[PDB]
Ligand binder design. Structure first.
Ligand SMILES: NC(=O)c1ccc[n+]([C@@H]2O[C@H](COP(=O)([O-])OP(=O)(O)OC[C@H]3O[C@@H](n4cnc5c(N)ncnc54)[C@H](OP(=O)(O)O)[C@@H]3O)[C@@H](O)[C@H]2O)c1
Ligand SMILES: NC(=O)c1ccc[n+]([C@@H]2O[C@H](COP(=O)([O-])OP(=O)(O)OC[C@H]3O[C@@H](n4cnc5c(N)ncnc54)[C@H](OP(=O)(O)O)[C@@H]3O)[C@@H](O)[C@H]2O)c1
Lengths: 486, 485
């Protein structure tokens, strides 16, 4: 009953040119909706609207912004089943995946509302007599939000909800493969009645709409989640107007399994960590590293559970384990990974078939450091298992990557756990749990090629505000020039 | 005098043997031969810092604090040498260089005091049986690239705090102040810091600085300098996803309302606008006065400016202003004066120059199109603008691309706070100079003035990252495969 459109300055509307594109389902190729193909002028209109809305939005008390976010939370709760539907048909997520994403998104919006009133500055001791010295927190201004296709709702809303809570306005450009999720977000914001211009949605190509956002002089900050190469390009262009950035650029997270574990549980945990959402998760367990003393048993058990994974149309029922990859380019890439591994002498334990956008888990052993699946982020269900002889070796292999997002170790030994945790070069680490653990109010982010900054709760607030030192001097002073005085 | 790099615990010549002669801005006399290092010397320093990183970051903080307390001890014995070099090399007066040295002692001590106290967080987990904490970790090897105006205090704020928190350092001082940098390395060497923890490389920004900024093993660059340079650095830094701290100058407003002690305001304004010949990022560069006191203010201000004594800063302790750092700066100030005259500006006083010396040029009848209103004037040329009310004062104050500091002079609490809130700057001062600065406060700007904050724990935030770690104490069930069982 409704057309998909941009949302700019309180109004749903077509791109100025009227150009559109057809969004199809990765499940079966069927048509989902025609969507805007916006260009530079649509981006500019959104930026100007965000800019004009900024001062009124930033200057109201935090409690008023919290109120708007609680309204959004209310509307989101009403829209849950619409979001689940779209995440499944447009993004290819299974029922359990999209259910989890929606539950997390509810928690994120609530978290941002909860924290709005409580972001504190500092009162300082002055080294000088008769002076008051404090630090306020101020919003950065208009913030560009540029997001990916894998968890398009939760990733977008973590950025959007927290950025808004602290008095910034937003220009949001969703991934081209997930525009309907972006439009549903705009629907939610509009029904919650946020002031015009405070939130704007522009649907269009990254190299056009996104680049205008990154280079516009009125944008103060860009928060971006996507590929490491896209991020470095954005960071470079952002420097032109000295805007700050937050960048979460993918990972190749190590899951380290020691010899003292419950092997069967380790295998159940490893299967979930490595293959959930078809491995299309930035903090997926992309490189599995097992101690030789349990390697045979682990590999056997891991493959045993992988055999059970059910791959199907995710709309079929609630128990489907894996849906399709997002598009044909992803399938082609996964084929290259498999092909490279096999040609290098790698042992394909299980899997390898694809059809349309579907791609089965493909598990390898007997790999070395020059395999493409050891050297690159594998954003799909192709996974190497590496056998190591001791903990030093576990750490060496774990760190032999350009990335550094998350990581995990399974062991019951407190010494081995903590030593490995300290030595693994990552922004996040988890002992006895999956690599993709995530909470709404924790600092989520990486080091090395995985990007810059942290998002979640107050860490998001840190990214999109600045500290403002203000003093009051209560005494008159004498000055060193002109020395001829008095 | 001959000066060298300090790399991996050793004072050494650049590998080309290339050197150049540094002269005094005061009289053009020789001061020293200094390295003209290249990309290989920078690479060596970076490599040394990288190899020293693990051992330096992983010792307890109290150990790093001890080294800093030792640096403090050595610095205290070298004070006079720093003052000498700051005057002869940088052109600073006795009062200026004394102030910089006192502040530098405080900076080093502040970094030592704070090292053991930088805390992470223990969080509430939304999950059962889960411990959730956040550690602070060193970023790695940090490049520090510095300017010539306050070469000691600016360098040490960055150096000491960055070291305190377990980073190693590659330092490239400004080409006009390389002896200051060498003296810093002397201080570090005598404190006995482990080899490679701190490294000095003297050479051209476009060669040595470029290599630091683009090298794969550098984790962070902290930079103080011109806005244009900063933008180039930030762009280059993106190639390897290193983070940056940038302080890029200012065009700070000093706002004077009609309820002030006018004579006091004039005295304060002279100090704020013209100390170190206005070569301060937080100099009061645009003076904005309420019409009700403007005539009286302008007269008193010019009266005090008249009294300033400009001379060889080596002469005695009472010289008010020395020279500018070089002839390029004098030529720039002449451009500013030329533009103001051409636009109808009224030169109330000053403008005389000889060699690197320049007598403060004060203009009235200026408007928003003058270069001295539109650009950072890093030197002794200052406009005074007259406004009719507080709204206009704010409009003029914010009509700049910069946003570093600013100040308002008034006894009215409502006007002071409303003006402070409305002025777009990273720092603001009520009833004091624009260039107020302490060792442990967040110093930095917004808009074109740069990115990030330095000073105390704010320096720590810039050169560390947060690291979320959890321990899960229960086993759970997972959603795939659903067939389980
Ligand atoms: N670190 C994390 O927290 C994390 C978690 C989730 C996702 N991811 C990463 O995201 C990757 C996949 O997502 P993706 O394919 O969407 O990554 P992407 O190709 O880098 O694109 C991400 C977003 O940037 C836009 N874009 C492309 N070029 C741009 C440009 N020149 N200027 C501005 N924006 C531009 C894209 O728009 P278009 O769609 O129109 O091209 C999209 O909205 C994963 O491989 C993973 O690396 C990382
Ligand atoms: N915001 C603040 O805290 C603050 C306070 C003090 C000074 N300043 C600013 O600093 C300006 C004056 O200082 P400045 O003349 O030294 O500015 P600058 O020309 O930008 O140079 C600063 C430093 O950067 C180096 N440099 C030049 N090009 C480089 C490159 N391509 N890559 C890496 N490094 C490079 C310089 O080395 P070389 O000497 O070899 O060129 C110097 O060490 C003032 O105008 C003001 O804007 C700002």
């Amino acid at each position: 009953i409704m057309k998909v459109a941009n949302y700019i300055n309180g109004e749903f509307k077509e791109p100025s040119t009227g150009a559109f594109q057809v969004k199809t389902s990765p499940v079966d190729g069927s048509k989902i909706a025609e969507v805007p193909r916006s260009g530079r002028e649509d981006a500019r209109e959104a930026i100007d609207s965000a800019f004009e809305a900024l001062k009124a939005w930033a200057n109201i008390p935090a409690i008023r912004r919290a109120e708007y976010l609680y309204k959004m939370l209310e509307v989101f709760r009403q829209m849950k089943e619409d979001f689940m539907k779209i995440l499944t048909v447009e993004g290819g997520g299974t029922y359990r995946k999209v259910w989890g994403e929606v539950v997390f998104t509810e928690r994120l919006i609530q978290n941002a509302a909860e924290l709005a009133r409580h972001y504190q500055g500092r009162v300082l001791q002055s080294d000088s007599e008769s002076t008051i010295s404090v630090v306020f927190k101020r919003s950065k201004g208009v913030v560009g939000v540029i997001t990916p296709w894998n968890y398009p709702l939760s990733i977008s809303m973590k950025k959007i909800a927290h950025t808004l809570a602290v008095g910034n306005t937003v220009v949001y450009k969703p991934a081209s493969d997930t525009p309907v999720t972006g439009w549903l977000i705009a629907q939610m914001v509009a029904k919650a009645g946020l002031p015009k211009g405070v939130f704007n949605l522009v649907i269009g190509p990254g190299p056009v709409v996104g680049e205008e956002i990154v280079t516009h002089k009125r944008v103060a900050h860009v928060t971006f989640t996507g590929e490491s190469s896209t991020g470095r390009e954005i960071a470079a262009k952002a420097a032109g107007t000295l805007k700050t950035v937050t960048l979460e650029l993918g990972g190749s997270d190590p899951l380290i399994i020691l010899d003292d574990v419950d092997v069967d549980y380790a295998a159940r945990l490893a299967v979930f960590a490595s293959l959930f959402h078809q491995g299309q998760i930035c903090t997926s367990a992309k490189r599995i590293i097992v101690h030789k003393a349990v390697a045979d048993k682990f590999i056997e058990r891991y493959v045993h559970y992988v055999k059970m994974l059910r791959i199907d149309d995710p709309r079929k029922d609630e128990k489907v384990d894996l849906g399709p990859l997002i598009n044909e380019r992803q399938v082609a890439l996964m084929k290259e990974f498999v092909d490279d591994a096999v040609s290098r002498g790698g042992r394909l334990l299980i899997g390898g078939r694809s059809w349309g956008n579907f791609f089965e888990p493909a598990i390898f052993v007997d790999v070395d450091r020059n395999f493409r699946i050891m050297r690159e982020e594998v954003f799909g269900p192709v996974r190497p298992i590496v056998v190591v002889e001791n903990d030093d070796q576990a750490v060496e292999v774990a760190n032999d990557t350009d990335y550094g997002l998350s990581g995990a170790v399974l062991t019951n030994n407190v010494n081995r756990a903590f030593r490995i945790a300290e030595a693994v070069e990552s922004g996040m680490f988890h002992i006895n749990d999956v690599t993709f653990l995530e909470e709404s109010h924790v600092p989520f982010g990486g080091i090395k090629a995985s990007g810059v900054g942290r998002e979640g709760g107050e860490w998001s607030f840190h990214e999109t505000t600045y500290d403002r030192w203000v003093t009051v001097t209560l005494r008159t002073r004498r000055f060193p020039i002109p020395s001829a005085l008095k």
